[PDB]
């Protein structure tokens, strides 16, 4: 039947219909998953985006920087999925970095106040969410987060790479904690996708030739990747997140699955 | 079903303990039409495979034999019907002479023996890919079996060196397979109690090496955040099926760790 | 002498147990003219450093303080001489509030505390590099202290996350330093018995974390093919000096493992 | 001098372009007493090694030859004097037949050729270590030459597979050498324009070699934060000397990257 048939999954990180989280939600719904969605700040606006999804799913406010939002989260999810019901999956598709820590802005010129906000949202929050939702999760469950390979330094990504490095390490500790509940915790290291964060927020930080800079990335990535890569299609990444939410990778935890077309395994 | 309407070649079945036996079993449970290859003890392999959920054709394949590999693509077509192609290939073949493993010192392994080991455990992954890529479908997958060789461990000795060579081979195969729209990956499994494994644990290859593997196993389940049961090959078989499916479409030249998460934990 | 006629800034001396104390000692033994930075307890730091082979100027430096970093380059030149530049910088600074390490649960660390930890242990490496690269000579070297964070270990918790962030910071610093002809590297040391470490082993931060560190040490010496004596910081200090010298000229944005070889061995 | 009063065996000199020639030169400049091993073209090697800063004995050594390896330890003692031991061994031996490396397709390499390559490039590191560890001093060092095989690159094909196998062999040698107080490491050099390399690359690119080598040279220099000059083997030779010295005493079974830091940068 459906890959995620009869599974209750919380999905965070939907802002646009371009968002990786939107496509994860779409593919999971196509596979018979009952979703619960998280939104940040503009909640009346996110509802209009999620209305374009295959099916109706409850939407909850969640600012990961907000301690009251996280404390109330587990209870708010239960009132949304029914008492005596638990989650089978959690998707962390949250990332942020102030522009001072991106693009052409010099690496040394990023104030720690900005880098800290970035690390809080992009890495610390993965642990914040896991703490908040593990009590309402089922043994056999899965936590999946989004990653960009930070093992080698790349220009323009700067302090966002540092937060991804921190995230990769956070995921390994979460794995230990989640393990006590019979829950797996993994990251999907995706290749580039023309989402809003990329196209607009990262693109903004690149200056005059930003457009060709982003196009050169797709071209070089499609080149390295033995099976090619399309920055305009989030479906391969969404499918990979669903594979992790399913019961088909049962002995995989505290790990990184590379959904990048195989570009990381190739030098040229 | 997960592998519904998929033609998959599975190699490496010798016992009902074999990782390939469990891959075959789970694949069949998921609606896959299999083709099986066997080495040397074919009478026994028929007998073993007869206990699978469904009947699947069995073909002779010694990876060291050039005539066997040259005829392989044609023999598979004659078994799956003309104008039909494979959607998956499972390489679950491994070998290392007794001199290259266990209590026998690392330096006392003759190159003739280490070479046989490398031929079968690593070079053969490329031999099979060359042989079967022409009869594969775009969207298909090649999956091989691996043990994490990034750190040196006692007793595994020269098999670690063959698995290191294999990890590298897999990355070149991905380039070649990529031209056909085929993915190539390895599943890095945790220690599994096959017949050889439990014989070695019973100090067959030697007592010092016997307790070594036993410490490895106990250590693996401690380190693994979700635990590791070396008496259950089903998590590994399920992971190979995930790779054969259409659910990891952007993953190639890679290693998926189906080891209970132990490679990520120091203690 | 290995570092003959070299001006090196050394940070991170607080006791005679400090890895920075031994780096300073070995560097001085090799003909290096040092400049030392101290944090908060300067009266004590003056007093410790007085027991070094030679007299070296001591400067106040809180990496969390923006005024301290802005004035740093000037203060160093007032200490080494006008028209003189540094040939080396040693970052031996680390910190993590008690809620981020030890027996305290991983999930119970407030971000305010984790942030302080990351600021001092990782961000500061970039803060120091920004501050001192203008007063550095082409051929120069920046060396930082690291603990291998690639695998998660109990008790280290959020200090591991800061080390992971540091490894990444070092790779970007490498790019920046490269413009000045300066190398940037980290020395991944094995566990060393500092006063802090010796305290934890005595169940200061809780018996469960005390036993954990003891198993870590015991395991490290087993794994290390040449052994690991956590009561001897001299091998680590010698490794930092090799990086400060002109003998690893093509090595930048990297990690040198001074851990007895433990990271390469599974058992 | 860095290697003052040290007896070092150096293998792999064939041309004045050879990485082993530059290691020998720098080691001699630092006060090392050398012993040289040569293969096949000994008449030519003698003439080349006369152009070195000092006279060093030359011994025949085909790593494929079992009689050569069995007699090696005795031949070295007869050359360095009885009761004297080696403090260092340099393995700068590599080989891959045309079919396994170049413009020839990955799948078109016969195993007979790939096996010769693996024997010489990887297995030999263990062969030499077995042969010379009995005549080595505690504190001693074995150093081998490696090209980063972690990611697959075009043309390098099976030489990458042998480098992968080598990285793993070095980790096992590290365990064996550890029993004698000997360290075992690899230097992961960036591309060096040696005569062997020029022909390998030159032969692969055909007529279109000019422009492509220029982009390749420019590519390395960009990626390397401190730059990379293929015409200069001195940074690599200096790095091998740092490993032969007493300045990296707690580093074994490891890889030191002398590539200008190119491996740490994505672009
Ligand atoms: N686009 C790529 O190339 C790419 C590649 C790899 C990984 N990623 C990762 O995928 C994830 C999603 O990014 P995307 O590219 O889909 O773009 P996006 O714009 O859709 O995602 C950013 C999301 O983070 C949320 N967010 C930010 N701060 C928050 C806070 N304080 N509390 C709650 N939510 C907050 C935003 O509301 C938004 O939905 C991120 O983790 C990103 O780093 C993106
Ligand atoms: N058992 C474990 O703990 C474990 C863990 C990780 C990986 N593996 C790997 O999984 C694979 C399967 O091993 P296993 O543990 O199931 O043991 P196994 O003995 O059941 O499987 C090895 C197979 O290789 C076959 N083979 C040997 N020489 C051959 C040749 N010349 N031509 C063709 N086939 C040949 C054997 O007949 C056998 O079927 C191997 O690659 C092994 O290295 C095993
Ligand atoms: N001890 C080990 O086992 C070990 C192993 C590997 C790496 N390390 C690393 O080596 C470094 C030194 O640690 P150590 O073991 O010598 O202990 P330590 O306590 O002697 O060193 C840490 C130093 O950080 C300094 N510091 C703290 N806050 C500061 C601030 N705001 N500004 C400037 N300096 C500040 C302290 O004065 C102290 O000198 C740390 O980065 C640590 O992570 C330690
Ligand atoms: N040149 C580069 O760009 C580069 C980069 C990284 C690593 N390396 C490595 O450096 C080493 C030296 O390579 P090079 O570029 O100086 O080329 P080279 O041809 O000058 O050196 C290789 C040596 O191997 C010897 N050799 C071959 N077969 C032998 C055998 N059977 N027995 C004994 N010796 C044998 C040759 O006589 C020769 O001296 C090799 O291990 C190579 O893989 C080279
Ligand atoms: C753990 C692992 O990889 N095991 C392999 C080892 C090589 N091999 C084997 N070798 C000799 C006799 C029978 N089998 C197959 C199983
Ligand atoms: C091995 C390691 O990382 N050690 C560090 C830990 C953090 N730190 C510290 N934090 C608080 C009090 C004193 N020291 C410095 C030493
Ligand atoms: C970069 C690298 O690994 N270079 C090696 C390759 C193998 N080799 C060689 N192979 C065939 C003929 C002569 N030399 C020596 C140089």
Author numbering:
A (entry chain A): 2 to 269
B (entry chain C), C (entry chain D), D (entry chain B): 3 to 269
Paper quotes:
Isoniazid (INH), a successful frontline TB drug for more than 50 years, targets the NADH‐dependent 2‐trans enoyl–acyl carrier protein (ACP) reductase InhA. InhA inhibitors are known to modulate the tertiary structure of the InhA protein binding pocket, in particular the substrate binding loop (SBL). Herein we describe the screening of such a library, in comparison with other fragment sets, against the highly validated Mycobacterium tuberculosis (Mtb) target InhA.
Crystals suitable for structure determination were obtained for fragments 4, 9, 12, 22, 24 and 34 bound to InhA. The InhA–NADH co‐crystal structures for FGC fragments 22 (pIC50=3.1) and 24 (pIC50<3) were found to be in accordance with the FGC‐FRAG set design principle, in that additional interactions were observed for their FG with the InhA protein. The co‐crystal structure of 24 contains a unique tetramer with four slightly different binding sites. The amide carbonyl FG of 24 forms an H‐bond interaction with the InhA Tyr158 residue and the NADH ribosyl‐20‐OH group, while the NH H‐bonds with Met199. FGC fragment 24 is able to identify distinct interactions associated with both leads 2 and 3 a. Fragment 24 was found to overlay well with HIST‐FRAG urea 12 (pIC50<3.0), with the embedded urea FG having similar interactions with Tyr158, Met199 and the NADH ribosyl hydroxy group. Overlay of the urea 12 with the amide 24 led to synthesis of the merged amide 36 and urea 37.
